[PDB]
Amino acid sequence: DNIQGITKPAIRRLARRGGVKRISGLIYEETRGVLKVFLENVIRDAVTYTEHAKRKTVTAMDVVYALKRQGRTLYGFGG
Amino acid sequence: RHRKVLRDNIQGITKPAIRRLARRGGVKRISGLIYEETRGVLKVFLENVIRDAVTYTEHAKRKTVTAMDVVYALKRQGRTLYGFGG
Amino acid sequence: KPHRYRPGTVALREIRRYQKSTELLIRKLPFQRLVREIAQDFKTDLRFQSSAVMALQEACEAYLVGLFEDTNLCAIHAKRVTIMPKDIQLARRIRGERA
Amino acid sequence: KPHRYRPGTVALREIRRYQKSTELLIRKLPFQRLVREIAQDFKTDLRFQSSAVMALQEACEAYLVGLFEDTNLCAIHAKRVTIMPKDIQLARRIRGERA
Amino acid sequence: KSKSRSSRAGLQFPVGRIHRLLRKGNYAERIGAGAPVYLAAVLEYLTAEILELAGNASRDNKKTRIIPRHLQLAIRNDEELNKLLGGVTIAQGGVLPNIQAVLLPK
Amino acid sequence: SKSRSSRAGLQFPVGRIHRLLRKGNYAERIGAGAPVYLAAVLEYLTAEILELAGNASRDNKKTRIIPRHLQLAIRNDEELNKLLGGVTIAQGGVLPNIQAVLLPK
Amino acid sequence: RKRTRKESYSIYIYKVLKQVHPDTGISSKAMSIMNSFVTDIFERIASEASRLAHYSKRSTISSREIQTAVRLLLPGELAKHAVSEGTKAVTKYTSSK
Amino acid sequence: TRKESYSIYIYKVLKQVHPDTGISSKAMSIMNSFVTDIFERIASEASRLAHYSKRSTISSREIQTAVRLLLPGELAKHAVSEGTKAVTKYTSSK
DNA sequence: ATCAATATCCACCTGCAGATTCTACCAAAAGTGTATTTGGAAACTGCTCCATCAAAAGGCATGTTCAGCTGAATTCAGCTGAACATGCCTTTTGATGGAGCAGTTTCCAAATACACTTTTGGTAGAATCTGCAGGTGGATATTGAT
DNA sequence: ATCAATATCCACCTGCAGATTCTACCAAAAGTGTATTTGGAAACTGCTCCATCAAAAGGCATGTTCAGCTGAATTCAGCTGAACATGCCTTTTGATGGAGCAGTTTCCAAATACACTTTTGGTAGAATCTGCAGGTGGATATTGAT
Ligand SMILES: [Cl-]
Ligand SMILES: [Cl-]
Ligand SMILES: [Cl-]
Ligand SMILES: [Mn+2]
Ligand SMILES: [Mn+2]
Ligand SMILES: [Mn+2]
Ligand SMILES: [Mn+2]
Ligand SMILES: [Mn+2]
Ligand SMILES: [Mn+2]
Ligand SMILES: [Mn+2]
Ligand SMILES: [Mn+2]
Ligand SMILES: [Mn+2]
Ligand SMILES: [Mn+2]
Ligand SMILES: [Mn+2]
Ligand SMILES: [Mn+2]
Ligand SMILES: [Mn+2]
Ligand SMILES: [Mn+2]
């Protein structure tokens, strides 16, 4: 399916930026889990903002507001 | 007439009370280095709360820190406290 | 003939005791002095509602017990049962308190 | 002659490279599908601003990189250099994310 | 005749007062008719959800009056209430009994 | 004939910031000095970051501030960092930092 | 000297307390806590609602605003039931006048 | 219509601290999000502060206390300075 | 540490495309000059609530002894995770067009804000009630030694 | 597989401190009747947005080989828990002076509410520039071997 599209090398790359040197093979599937939970929660909140605005298209502000209200403020798309 | 001089009071956080707290935390064995470490953390924690509470006090032109000042203080610090006013 | 609980037995006892419990664990007055000291170093001539001093204690003991939970987890994570300052520091670094 | 760098060297090399860089590290389309799949579980017929899909990836990669940081610290805490799922889990608990 | 808005909505919580608190709270310029009703309802629902759970705790703990400990047991044992009040400290609440397995003897 | 921003010696628009305060449901009346004071604070912080970022830019031999520069500017400063501890800068990246035990030899 | 009434949510919490446990009473520190819980959640909703009105350039907070608010703030199930109750409370309040 | 920014002011400020440097557009927006953000924290805390004291008016005093509460100490001090300065200057002009 | 040989990096230059800066204009904000409002700062002052102070009592904090069991130091083999070259395919990306919609306008009926004028619901102490906090003494586990 | 030593539970009791009920004003709901707004409900734009298309290109999936790391097993000094004797100072209970909230009145400097009157900041084409992405050719780093 689509999570699996979050490839092991890309997972390995993110880890690298994190300063990670050695990666257990079990990490990748664990990581895919976290990422899907992360995304779900953000998107759920985003679409709610969408639905509130009587729209059918998620805007970048919908994502921002969502992130902002979840404790993860994002600069660069706001306004 | 004059006030008494307060100092070294973080030692009032006795080792028994630090242990008691760890127990409620579910801690079984405690290194001897912990107690002085804890005192550090507690003081930072406490300072920051008192700094803000007192900032609410002076803003309200008062000399008495109210329980609401601590509550607001705690709140804008990420730690909402029920039991003293809202 | 003298009788001794094995090491770690009174600790488990103590945990079950204090978790079952709800009372403040720091002495009332020693803590109040601490509050009046710290406060006074930030501003002078300050008075405190007895409730305000209590509110602070309630928050502080809440905080420290919370902190000791996470500490105890890093200790276990490191294959230990003894919390160390290193563990408190990992907890706080990750809590983001001061990384 | 066939030639091999020792284990962990290209890793270090990779680290210095990616910490120096700023680019998104998950591929844009696989991610975009992932976004759109998940989203239609909440409402149907949804369109996405390009900026909106992008904002999300920035946030996710920010989140995950941050998480691998705190994770690698738990790996180190256990006298290891290999991140494991224990580590990711300990981080997520102390972050308060789902304890 | 006297009819109150609270009763007109079938609620215990005071729709009137909650309409005023909205108007007076710098939330927006005009407050809609249903906003205080809907909110009084939601505040009322949650109060009950917590209170029933707490009452069980008081009874499970032999007692006739709910004290803080009880509200804490009620909240920290309900996965959803617990998430709602994740950042909240309940004075005199204590903590849920929990001892890591690796700590028990055998 | 003469604007409040220049009247306070500011670049930031005391004018707009007063309208935004009124129109933001913050309180019923907004004070005369509040938008000045606020505009003053906002400019200071802007300047503070921006110089730090410009310094970051020249050090990578560049003349234009990109996000990386802003991210470098912010996380290398103990106080701006505390202020934006919860903020993510898109296209910012992270500070080069590698735990010691991971180095070889 | 003539204390300016400090109003509470007490009597209502009590009423509801009685509706679920006619059995049980409530300690005053517990009552106070509850009283702090109601005011808290009031503000969270009312705030989020405030923002929502701002994003849609609306000057008015409607039961519709509170609702989206409640969906964002509450967890599932608490959200679902809380929506129902509000929706119910509202149309019943409509239907009377 | 017109979607307004803090861009031209950010730029103006960019030049008087650094006349050398230009600013990437995606970077310019980052800054724009920074200004609106901090705007909101201060204004929000300021609102709250007026409430705690049952006041109907947000004054420079409220903005100040706010700034002491949001900003870190060195940053707080300097900002209070600059803020007091701009106010006293704008007072004194008319 | 040298001795040598793949690969990795780093510098200096270089041509251009993608953006960035620079220029030329107009509704909508901003600044003004009045006419009022109005909040809240000052000036008493009735009164909770804080700060001391004292005096007596045991609940605990301190400090010492002492040995059990934990943490740390060491060793080592099995095997997991890195590096590497191959072979393949999914992602990129570049228009190209059609259409779904955000984003704006133009009214109006519905809903809300006012301004007063009554009508209760809540609240603040007094007046009663009643959990349960503490204190005992025997049954039931739990724990640790022969 | 047992008993001796403690700690844990559970019931039953009884007066008070804290909860509940009872009464009585007042701030605040509620009911009416004008006097505004506003949030949509339709008609239509221009626009970003999905859907393909069609190659090309790196980026990914596999499999092989093995370095080196994680986990296991053992060992031991010495740290930290359990227990005890001592007496300190915290906790309790009561009283008192007065500092400082809190509550009302009184009244201007300050803010709002208009009504116009400027001015600025936004938008769409216009006009240079800064890096990116490659290109050598020069030391560096990493690794295999006397
Ligand atoms: Cl002002
Ligand atoms: Cl009544
Ligand atoms: Cl001009
Ligand atoms: Mn004994
Ligand atoms: Mn029931
Ligand atoms: Mn060179
Ligand atoms: Mn024109
Ligand atoms: Mn002693
Ligand atoms: Mn061990
Ligand atoms: Mn009545
Ligand atoms: Mn008892
Ligand atoms: Mn040792
Ligand atoms: Mn202009
Ligand atoms: Mn280059
Ligand atoms: Mn290059
Ligand atoms: Mn080359
Ligand atoms: Mn070899």
Q: Report the SS3 class of residue B50.
A: helix
**8 A C-beta contact, residue A61 and residue D54:** no
Q: CB-based contacts of E74: which residues, under 8 Å, 6+ apart?
A: E50, E53, E54, E56, E57, E81
Q: How far is CA D76 from the centre of its chain?
A: 18
At residue B83, the 3 state secondary structure works out as coil
Largest CA distance in chain A: 48
The resolution in angstroms reads 3.1
Q: What is the DSSP letter of F26?
A: S
Residue closest to B79 by CA, chosen among C63, E92, F87: C63
Q: Which CATH class is domain E1-106?
A: mainly alpha
- H helix intervals, E1-106: 5-9, 15-23, 34-60, 68-76, 79-84
- What angle separates helix C28-40 from helix C50-77, to the nearest 10 degrees? 100
User: Residues with Cβ < 8 Å from H30, sequence gap 6 or more?
Assistant: A75, A76, F67, F70, F89, F90, F92
Surface-to-core class of residue C22, CB atoms within 10 Å of its CB (0-12 exposed, 13-18 middle, 19+ buried): middle
CATH number of the structural domain spanning residue H76:
1.10.20.10
Cα first-last separation, chain D = 52
Domains contained in chain H, number:
1
Distance CA D57, CA G96 (A): 50
Residue F86 dihedral angles phi and psi, to the nearest 5°: -95, 15
Cα dist from F70 to A76, B83, E91, H36, H71, whole Å: 11, 43, 42, 16, 19
Q: Which residues contact E95 (CB under 8 A, 6 or more apart)?
A: B24, C19, C65, E72, E76
Nucleotide nearest to E4 (CA to C1'): J30
DSSP E strand boundaries for chain B = 29-30, 64-65, 80-82
Task: Please state, in angstroms and rounded to a whole number, the distance separating the CA atoms of residues C88 and C82.
Answer: 12
Domains of chain D, by residue range, sit at: 1-99
E106 vs F4: CA distance, rounded Å: 77
Nearest Cα to E51, choosing from B38, C15, G27?
G27
Residues in chain H: 94
D62 touches chain F (CB under 8 A): yes
CA distances from C21 to C28, C53, E76 (A): 17, 21, 15
> What's the gap between Cα A33 and its chain centre?
11
Give the contacts of G75 (CB within 8 A, at least 6 positions apart).
E80, E83, E84
Contact E23, G52 (CB under 8 A): no
The pair of structure tokens assigned to B53 is: 């509470």
Q: What is the DSSP string of C6-74?
A: PTTHHHHHHHHHHHH--S--S-HHHHHHHHHHHHHTTSSS-EE-HHHHHHHHHHHHHHHHHHHHHHHHH
Q: What's the CA gap between A42 and D35, in Å, rounded?
A: 10
Is any atom of nucleic acid chain I found less than 7 Å from the CB of residue F62?
no
The topology (CATH level 3) of D1-99 is Histone, subunit A (1.10.20)
Question: Which CA-bearing residue is nearest the C1' of I30?
Answer: F15
**How would you class D81 by CB atoms within 10 Å of its CB: exposed for 0-12, middle for 13-18, buried for 19 or more?**
middle
Backbone dihedral region of F17: left (phi > 0), alpha (psi from -120 to 50 degrees) or beta?
Answer: alpha
Interatomic CA distance for residues F45 and C9, integer angstroms: 57
Helix (H) or strand (E) segment spanning residue C94: helix C85-95
Rounded to an integer, what distance in angstroms lies between the CA atom of residue F14 and that of residue G51?
23
- State the Cα–Cα distance between residues G13 and E48, nearest whole angstrom: 8
Query: Which residue is listed with tokens 């997520």?
Result: D92
Within chain F, residue ranges assigned H as helices are 4-8, 14-22, 34-59, 67-75, 78-83
Give me the residue label for tokens 């724009």: H32
Radius of gyration of chain G (CA): 16
F with A: touching (≥3 Cβ pairs within 8 Å): yes
Residue F88: strand, helix, or coil: strand
Tell me which DSSP letter residue B9 carries: G
CB-based contact (8 Å) between G55 and chain A?
Answer: yes
Contact A50, D43 (CB under 8 A): yes
Query: Containing domain of residue G62, as a range?
Result: 1-97
Name the nearest CA neighbour of G72 among G40, G47, G54, G38.
G47
b/e burial code for range H27-59 (CB count within 10 A of at least 16 → b)? bbbbbbbbbbbbbeebbbbbbbbbeeeebeebb
E34-60 and E68-76 helices, crossing angle to 10°:
100
CB-CB contact of E96 with E77 (8 Å): yes
Q: Do E99 and C59 touch (CB under 8 A)?
A: no
Q: How far is the CA of C19 from the centre of ligand 5 (A)?
A: 28
Domains recognised in chain A with CATH numbers: 1-79 (1.10.20.10)
CA distance A75 to chain D (A): 9
- Which superfamily does F1-105 belong to? Histone, subunit A (1.10.20.10)
**Cβ atoms within 10 A of the Cβ of F41, count?**
29
H57 and F9 within 8 Å at the Cβ level: the answer is: no
CA distances from B36 to B40, C84, C88 (A): 7, 11, 12
D12 nearest nt, CA–C1': I82
Chain D adjacent subunits, 3+ CB pairs under 8 A:
A, C, F
Q: Do A76 and D58 touch (CB under 8 A)?
A: yes
Query: Helix or strand or coil: residue B28?
Result: coil
Q: Contact, E50 vs G86, CB < 8 A?
A: no
* CA–CA gap between residue G46 and residue G53 (Å, rounded): 10
CA F72/CA C8 separation, integer angstroms? 49
Phi and psi angles of residue A72, each rounded to the nearest 5 degrees, phi first: -125, 70
Q: Is the CB of A70 under 7 A from strand I?
A: no
Closest CA to B9 of A21, C34, H34: C34
Three-class SS of residue F94?
coil
